[PDB]
Design a protein around this ligand. Structure first.
Ligand SMILES: Nc1nc2c(ncn2[C@@H]2O[C@@H]3COP(=O)(O)O[C@H]4[C@@H](O)[C@H](n5cnc6c(=O)[nH]c(N)nc65)O[C@@H]4COP(=O)(O)O[C@H]3[C@H]2O)c(=O)[nH]1
Ligand SMILES: Nc1nc2c(ncn2[C@@H]2O[C@@H]3COP(=O)(O)O[C@H]4[C@@H](O)[C@H](n5cnc6c(=O)[nH]c(N)nc65)O[C@@H]4COP(=O)(O)O[C@H]3[C@H]2O)c(=O)[nH]1
Ligand SMILES: Nc1nc2c(ncn2[C@@H]2O[C@@H]3COP(=O)(O)O[C@H]4[C@@H](O)[C@H](n5cnc6c(=O)[nH]c(N)nc65)O[C@@H]4COP(=O)(O)O[C@H]3[C@H]2O)c(=O)[nH]1
Lengths: 171, 177, 177, 171, 177, 171
């Protein structure tokens, strides 16, 4: 089990689940379509993977997110809607499919909230510039806690259980 | 002098600034345009107000956000993403036109009104930081909630003060409704 | 009198002068021309201002530089490199024309405005020299930051005064915005 | 472990990484093209080698940089863009390739910031003209510290990790 | 009186006179013709001024020299070398024509303006004579620099006064700019 | 090791290096061509030999310089260019080579600054006309100091290191 700590892996995981993963899953289940490039596409079924990098960059996970999106053929799409949508990166299970017919979708998201952890660590613990085993252990433990909490929370909602997966220690 | 605590007001504020406020401010500064219903509008000058609710609801700030967004005009738009950078995503937000009747084709001033959704996390942490066996008005819960909202606002003010991209372009509205 | 210290305002100022200010000044003195959007433009009389920000942002002077370069005209050009010397690289910079509407064909004055990007390093050294466990205005950090900016400006002024190439052709604007 | 010192090898390395290496790596990743002689060439991939000379000259690393660019067929090119470009020296991984098609580029940069170290040494330590073993050791240690800090910082950002190499003690 | 010292203003002045001023004056007196762009021009009456800068730059008189030679006309020429004597080399210098618009074919009065490059060495000696751990305006450095420049000028004056070849044809301009 | 003295070997060597040797080497490296009798010749590679004569003549090294240039087939050439050229005496590595093609050049220079030392010696110490072993020792030591300082400064700049040699005690 996980508990609230001084550096927020549990709370950030809870916020990420309740603000993005739960909401995006519910929106896809309800509307059953995603809007990209000004045009809608139906979703036969969605599988969303949250990718937790093995190590966080000094300046946040934005660079890793951009490189990961470049590596694969990920395309941007928002959840169709006084409430805002949720842009995300996804790929179609087959290389391509007829747009008019519904197409299964493979959402991929690198949690931007992980950037906060970096910041928190800068406050949590230095006047040295080098590999610090204490801070490395802290990063690894916080990433593990984030993944564990997110998995447990996904194991609660029928709208996300089975449809959401966690891929930790990527690259 | 805010810092880290078991209740992550400081960390959530830092994340909100470095993920949405800073990113949105930089994107609007650079592109000088936003996207609404798929069509672009150039932005002459923008301004963002972070509306911190006076008190957080039981189920997050979603209901307050949705009621505040339609009590005012606050049409939904997204900050444009250049075709060059495929990895970066867009940041949807809610905005009004400071002159309500303005030429969309011409450059237009925009007022960005965003209620930090990350505050919802605070609520979901209050149930964990100080679990309550009883249901009803708790004077300790309210004190912690107000203290952490104030910490959030103070952290946002400080962070906005330390960036020319956002300094003077972002204001934090505290104790709204 | 400024000397070496843990915070490298002196060393960074020396490097900035010897690598950009001196090099650009000598290149414009010799070639008497610059490269705007790839096209040659002759320089009649140039002059450089080193815009030292009053306070450095959290993430370096990048955002302040990018907002300053567009608040004013400050189109981007590069100091030309002759084909004979292949090794030497060009130094891009931002400049305006003192008469904004001037014939590019004929020799034209240019006002070079450069916010030293090296100042960013100072910020990244403040996080090392005096680490802080808390986020918020620190009156000790502000003192060190302003002292280091003052040292940078003073060293730049001195080094400019000791070279006919840069003496009088370079000005240090301190405490800007 | 590297910390701030009186003669700035660590701070100069941090500035070099955050101002040139990181910025150039991200710009190449994003734009995926470099402008040379005023015309663009696409970049399938890039490798950035930062060359730390064995010994810094008395007047700075400028002469070594010019000689290095002369010895190899390195060509000048900026990063396409109120922000400026980053001119650099690069070489294409075959002898030549069709410009229309994307071509891999091997950037080679001798950090000009190393010049500052020379100046710093002049302030750090003499009224003599000869091989000063004390200053020689100081220069060697500063070059080693610069290389170590730059390697560590390269190993942090996903936009430079694996794509940037450090060649220390060259010639 | 001027004598030898650790800072070699006297020795450098002696070398400058015996190597450039005396040689150039004697060669112009004899040949009465110089070489501009490879083309011979006859000299009717010449005169040399040794422009001693008021203050020496940090990196030698190179920048001041090349900026003075361009602020005024001062086209570069070289004293002609007779084909008979192969061993002797030429002495390039910068000169203008006292009447700016004069016939090159006919004899022409020439004004030779030379900023002693040897003064650069003095700077390189001041760093050795009185090493400084700090960078900034030093009142002791300035005194030594001005004293050495004045000694250089005085030695040049004396040496010129002692030779009919250079007496009355060479003037030392002290404290220029 | 060398330091400033009353009769300037070190300062004269520094001036010779920074005013002729460094400048000439840099200009040859840059322009890669030398002008002789008004026509340019490309330089494939250059070697600069600075000759320190065994003993300085009474009137200076000018007469020795003329004799040395007479002995060999040295030819005059300036460095192409508000900066002046640097006339010098050079020789082609082979007996002759095609003008159009680049040709190696063995620049040969007898430092005229050495003449100054003679005058310096006249001021350093006599009312006799004869062999003064004291003055001979001073002259030899000063020539050694000049050669040592010039050798050291040559191995400091990458533009002159390896391309410049010092031939002390010639004839
Ligand atoms: N692909 C994708 N992921 C999303 C989106 N919204 C949230 N997330 C993820 O969920 C984290 C926390 O969301 P939050 O509680 O709503 O709290 C958010 C939220 O209140 C605000 N924010 C972030 N992005 C946006 C946005 O695009 N529009 C608006 N109006 N607010 C945003 O900043 C706070 C912190 O954001 P992060 O630290 O980066 O971390 C976010 C992010 O990793 C989305 O629209 N698309
Ligand atoms: N407008 C303009 N300013 C210039 C330029 N080059 C240097 N500066 C300024 O001079 C400072 C020191 O440069 P550096 O010592 O040669 O040492 C630099 C250099 O080694 C490298 N670097 C910086 N910019 C470039 C570039 O544009 N091209 C290449 N190839 N290297 C660069 O990073 C070091 C530190 O950079 P900074 O922190 O940014 O700080 C730079 C920067 O503020 C230029 O081309 N244009
Ligand atoms: N305008 C002009 N001025 C001249 C010329 N030759 C000498 N001078 C001046 O006389 C000073 C002393 O010359 P040096 O004793 O023969 O001793 C000189 C000489 O051995 C050598 N050197 C300097 N310039 C040249 C050159 O142009 N050609 C050659 N072959 N050697 C040079 O470096 C020594 C010190 O040079 P500096 O520090 O520059 O200082 C030089 C320089 O200021 C000349 O041809 N044209």
């Amino acid at each position: 089990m996980s508990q609230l700590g001084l550096l927020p892996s549990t709370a950030l995981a809870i916020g990420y689940y309740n603000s993005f993963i739960k909401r995006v899953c519910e929106e896809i289940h309800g509307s059953e379509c995603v809007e990209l490039e000004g045009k809608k596409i139906k979703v036969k079924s969605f599988r969303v993977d949250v990718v937790i990098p093995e190590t966080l960059d000094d300046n946040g996970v934005g660079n890793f997110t951009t490189l990961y999106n470049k590596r694969y053929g990920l395309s941007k799409a928002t959840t169709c809607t006084g409430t805002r949508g949720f842009p995300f990166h996804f790929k179609v299970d087959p290389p391509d499919a007829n747009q008019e017919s519904p197409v299964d979708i493979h959402l991929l998201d690198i949690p931007s909230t992980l950037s906060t952890i970096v910041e928190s660590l800068k406050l949590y613990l230095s006047n040295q510039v080098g590999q610090d085993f204490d801070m490395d252990y802290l990063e690894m433990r916080e990433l593990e806690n984030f993944a564990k909490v997110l998995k447990y929370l996904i194991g609660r909602n029928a709208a996300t259980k089975g449809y959401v997966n966690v891929l930790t220690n990527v690259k």
